[PDB]
Paper text:
The B-components of the C. perfringens, C. difficile, and C. spiroforme systems bind to the host cell’s lipolysis-stimulated lipoprotein receptor (LSR), after which the A–B complex is internalized by endocytosis. Then, the A-component is translocated via the B-component pore across the endosomal membrane into the cytosol, assisted by host-cell chaperones, including Hsp90 and Hsp70. In the cytosol, the A-component covalently transfers an ADP-ribose to actin, causing F-actin depolymerization, cell rounding, and eventually cell death.
By contrast, the short structure showed no density at the tip of the β-barrel stem (residues 332–363) because of its flexibility. The most striking difference between the structures was that D4II (receptor-binding domain II) was observed in the long, but not in the short complex. Binding induces the unfolding and tilting of the first N-terminal α-helix of CDTa, in addition to conformational changes to one of the constriction sites in the CDTb-pore, called the NSS-loop, which grips CDTa. Our 2.56-Å resolution analysis provided more precise insights, revealing ‘in’ and ‘out’ loop conformations (blue and yellow, respectively). The short CDTa-bound CDTb-pore map represents the total map, showing the small differences between folded and unfolded CDTa.
Author numbering:
A (entry chain E): 492 to 539
B (entry chain B): 299 to 331, 364 to 742
C (entry chain C): 299 to 331, 364 to 539
D (entry chain H): 19 to 413
Amino acid sequence: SSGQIVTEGNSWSDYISQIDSISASIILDTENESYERRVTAKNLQDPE
Amino acid sequence: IVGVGMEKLIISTNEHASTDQGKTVSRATTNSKSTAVQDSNGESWNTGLSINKGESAYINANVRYYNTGTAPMYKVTPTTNLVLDGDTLSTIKAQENQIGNNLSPGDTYPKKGLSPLALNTMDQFSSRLIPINYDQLKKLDAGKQIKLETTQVSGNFGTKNSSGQIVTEGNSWSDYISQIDSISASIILDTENESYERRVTAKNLQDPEDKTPELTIGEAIEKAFGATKKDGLLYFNDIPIDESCVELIFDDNTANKIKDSLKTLSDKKIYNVKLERGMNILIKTPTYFTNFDDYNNYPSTWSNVNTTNQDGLQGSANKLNGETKIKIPMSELKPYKRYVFSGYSKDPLTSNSIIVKIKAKEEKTDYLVPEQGYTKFSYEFETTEKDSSNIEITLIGSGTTYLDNLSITELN
Amino acid sequence: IVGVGMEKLIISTNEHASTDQGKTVSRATTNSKSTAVQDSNGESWNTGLSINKGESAYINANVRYYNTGTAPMYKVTPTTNLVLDGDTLSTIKAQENQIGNNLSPGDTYPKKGLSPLALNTMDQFSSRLIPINYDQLKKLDAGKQIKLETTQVSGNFGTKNSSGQIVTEGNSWSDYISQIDSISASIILDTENESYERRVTAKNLQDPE
Amino acid sequence: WERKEAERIEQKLERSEKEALESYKKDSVEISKYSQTRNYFYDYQIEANSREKEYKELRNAISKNKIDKPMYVYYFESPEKFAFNKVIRTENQNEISLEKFNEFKETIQNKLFKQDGFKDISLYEPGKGDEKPTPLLMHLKLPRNTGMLPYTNTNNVSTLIEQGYSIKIDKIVRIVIDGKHYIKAEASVVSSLDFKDDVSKGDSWGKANYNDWSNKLTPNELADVNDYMRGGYTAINNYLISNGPVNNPNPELDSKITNIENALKREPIPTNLTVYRRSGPQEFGLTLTSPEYDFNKLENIDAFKSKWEGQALSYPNFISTSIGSVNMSAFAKRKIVLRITIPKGSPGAYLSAIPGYAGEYEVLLNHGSKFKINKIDSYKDGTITKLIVDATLIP
Ligand SMILES: [Ca+2]
């Protein structure tokens, strides 16, 4: 709220499962560098 | 009021013992310019014993906690000394393994019927045993004993938080121990199989702004122990604890204060003296006591039974020209204890003294001259074996003396 | 109402055993003023056994917890005594390895159908084993048995928030044991296959309030 | 983490707000009461009050920290603040009947209520260990970029905000908390522009919004409006009160009325605004000599609120009002102040836009304007208790 940055208590493990559950994984390999991404995908069985 | 009592000590000698065993087979051949062939066989045995003089043995103490106060203690954490002769071997504060969660007044941790707990570690995490030297081990093997003394106890009390829940964390009794001791007098009632210790607030007369109410010693005793009154005398449950029916033990300061206050008093009764800060009063109910009116406790029966006169401290005297005989079977007294026999006497008209005869271990004879009023004599004796001969108390005397409130009380 | 029962005890004798074997070869020559040449060779065997009289063995006890009350206990942490003949060998408060998360009334930890848990450490961080003497080891070898007594049990209760949020941290049962025992009577029904223990509030007739 | 955030936010406060917050921790009720009714005095007392610096620094400290997202708050409110003079239930009763629920629902059907003071709120639902002083519980959704100051108390953490808006209640239901019935109301904040004491800021806004408005007026109608507001507004309003076109029609004033109405209609107010007008007893159908004008006894205030609060209004003439709320010597004797919220798009113009003394930041509204009164509150003014009316302009 003051413009500062805090990292204590902000764990990625709290979001890893949620992100993996609702996304698709895409990897681009090229030659010098690899890139991995998650893109949100729609669930067609849920009208909401 | 929490104390610690040791029940037994266990010694773990720290010695290393080893044994070896071997066998060998040889063979030789010589060519001297003759020839020879030698065959050999062998066996061996060995024993060893290594001892470290710095840490020769480890000690384990089985202990109990007890509470004689008016309030429970939560998270009981005592600190104890271990003294061999005049040396404190170590002082240990109780760790997580030796902490009592609850200790109600009159209860014990561990509870009655369970084994004592083991105090066998000294470090903060219960990972290091308690060592002793070689000389201390020799002293222990020579028959000397280790005594346990408790120096302090840490504990918690309970309050209510913003909700109705009880909270004990952060509520330390040590924050109040000094303040309570500074403004109170201490009174102890010994009874027979239970001890009671109390603190009663006393008024400071040097401070005009001290508005705490004033109390006499009798009122303080009645309030502290919840005693009831039957005929102007205090009863704890059924035992009479009036000053004429018990033994009162003070320290020097309390005795001096009481003596100074008595001379300026009108009734001249100890229970009428004003209570003051720093007083130490110990009340000890007798084992056997009779007032010749309604209370009798002796196993035998006194020879002279004549209580039809309105005399004595309270409406009974039981004394004429005859003599009183009592015999203690010695099967109802403690084997090795220092008992005391006490009572009150009076000679309204001057006459001869009374021959006081006590025969428990060494026979003794003593003489007491009654004054115009009531005074107490309180001679001493001692038991021997719990199976030896009986104890006989006789007070042969003449001159129509008087007696009341005969009692026998143990002392330590 | 939580108690601990011991199912068996295991002893770990702390002995060191060694074994050696060697071979030697010699050769000598003598000149006198005669000559002589001597050839020798031998071998040997050895055995050893060392013992510490202070810590001669380690003990390991298999135990279960049970609840015969009306409320569950969370984070069950009992304290037990190990008694051999008339001596308390040690008193251990359960460490993180021996703490039961849940213990419902009528249940057992570990649950029915699982093996008992092992209590084999005495220090706070579960890095120190439980030792005994040489004399205690001899007594054990003579057929004497070790008894286990539970002295107290620590545990927590849950306070339910208006939105159904259970909290157990900081809610100690020891804060209420004395108060409940002071104003209640204890009633036990034994039956045959299950026991039930209860406390019922009783009225003090000496207090008009 | 909440305690750490509170410590972080309170550390960067400077000293003056530090003793201001410390003083708030012991004298909350008086500071809140003063902050509620502070801008209705003269220019002298507001600077001369013993708590003005306290309020100023507390407001600055609150406004230092702002939220970047809408979020919900929970607090208990007295039903009297929502123009309900009855009792839902006593503090010892457990249940509320259907009749009281229906009456309270009827009282708050279509109304807006203004909150203008400090308040302690909670970011979590009021569970066990909290206080339940009133049988009404509020679920309020705060807008983005609003002040919010978390401060650590002796044992717990509490948050303080400054109310400067008006709220409306959407739905109310009956809930049970620990065996007692309460009323839970979901409320939303309606934004509006209010210049409580920044009369300079309000004047600057009026300049920036209406200085070029005169250039949009045809010269004949512009001069007509200028001369009328200069000299003949009293006569026009007097003619309009008597329903002049109904009794004695005459075009010499009907043309004036039409020109003024068209000039007002030319440029409407772009943003929701609150205007303060010191009304008189003659407007409310009373006289200075009327006994009901004495608002010192409780009976007069109670009867006036019973017969007037919650009802409608209608002014045949034009309404002149000031953006600021501070009292002036011109209307010193007037005991009634009218607080009006102007919905966006309504007709009206800033008279003070034109140079010279065009009035006391005067704003004109079309004739026949109707208002709805939501609630009425009373504040002390020296030795007399004056009265405040909250009204909403309706089309
Ligand atoms: Ca008597």
